[PDB]
Amino acid sequence: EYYR
Amino acid sequence: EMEKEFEQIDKSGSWAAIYQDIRHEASDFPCRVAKLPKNKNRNRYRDVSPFDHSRIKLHQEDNDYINASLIKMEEAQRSYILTQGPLPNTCGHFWEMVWEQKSRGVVMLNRVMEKGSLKCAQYWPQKEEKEMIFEDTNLKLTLISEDIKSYYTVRQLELENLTTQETREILHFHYTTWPAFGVPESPASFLNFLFKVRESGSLSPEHGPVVVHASAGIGRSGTFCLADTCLLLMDKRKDPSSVDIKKVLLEMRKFRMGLIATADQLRFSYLAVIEGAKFIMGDSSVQDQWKELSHEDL
């Protein structure tokens, strides 16, 4: 997963 | 003058440009320990990590890594610890840090589930009869009381070290209506929440650093730290003109990457400081007007  | 700059960016529409300059000039320090393999499952997101030079170290022998960062503002005389949303397996780590760094306040600016996804583990008990026992760090956490307002909730938590039997009181400040990558409903509802933390004494220098976290701990978290610090400089220097928000944000990005996530979060930071500047200068009626306009009573 990635925050942006 | 912030207002002269603020008005100047709103008429030029260059908020996405001013913010993009900040991402350009932001510091870039090595995250060696974060990108280690053994700490992969301790990192909620892959693009968010602490700098080795500012990361919080856990006082255990096994693995000392927790996605947390000590942000120290020497001039402003205040420190904060920003961290990701605790994963289900770093909840004991989260409270181990709180104990070791001698913190009294936690500030939670997200919900455990937002926009249909799970942004944060339920790292604190919801019922006084159901206390949480983390066996990995030998801690016990018990809910004592909670004052529920319309958009925020202040809990009172007792944390016990099962090894030594010392107990501490931890205030939990939960802001429930600040969406990820969004902004508060109004500057009054934000400032009314900030000062509710100030008056509780969690930010006092006799305690440890306060713990401030959202889902990744940079978006909403930095906005909260940026406003408090700027207001803090403005009461010390007594010279509000001298407070450059763009610089103070760049200073914090030395200790944790990605602080402030959107351009409008940066915009709100200006408005928050501009309005809060009224109390610093001496306005005593604005203390309650924020309380009235926030509509906390509900």
Author numbering:
A (entry chain C): 1161 to 1164
B (entry chain A): 2 to 299
Describing publication, verbatim:
Protein Tyrosine Phosphatase 1B (PTP1B) is the prototypical protein tyrosine phosphatase and plays an essential role in the regulation of several kinase-driven signalling pathways. Here we identify PTP1B as an inhibitor of IL-6 and show that, in vitro, it can dephosphorylate all four members of the JAK family. Dephosphorylation of substrate is initiated by nucleophilic attack by the active-site cysteine (Cys215) to form a phosphoenzyme intermediate followed by hydrolysis of the cysteinyl-phosphate to release free phosphate. Asp181 acts as both a proton donor, enabling protonation of the tyrosyl leaving group, and as a proton acceptor, receiving a proton from the water molecule that hydrolyzes the phosphoenzyme intermediate.
To clarify which pTyr was the preferred substrate, we therefore performed co-crystallisation experiments using the C215A/D181A/Q262A triple mutant which is catalytically dead. To understand the association of the triple substrate trapping mutant of PTP1B with the JAK activation loops, the co-crystal structures of the PTP1B C215A/D181A/Q262A triple mutant bound to the JAK2 and TYK2 activation loop peptides were solved to 2.01 and 2.79 Å resolution respectively. In both the JAK2 and TYK2 bisphosphorylated activation loop structures (with the catalytically-dead D181A/Q262A/C215A mutant), the second pTyr occupied the catalytic pocket, whereas previous structures with the IRK activation loop showed the opposite. In contrast to IRK, we found that the first phosphotyrosine (phosphotyrosine 1007 of JAK2 and phosphotyrosine 1045 of TYK2) in both of these structures was located in a shallow, basic surface near Arg 47. The guanidinium group of Arg 47 forms a salt bridge with the phosphate while the backbones of both amino-acids form hydrogen bonds with one another. In all models, the sidechain of Asp 48 formed a hydrogen-bond with the backbone amide of the phosphotyrosine in the catalytic site as well and the +1 residue of the peptide. The location of the second pTyr in the active site means that the second aryl binding site is unoccupied. Instead, the first pTyr is located on a shallow basic surface centered upon R47. An R47A mutant of PTP1B lost its preference for the second pTyr.
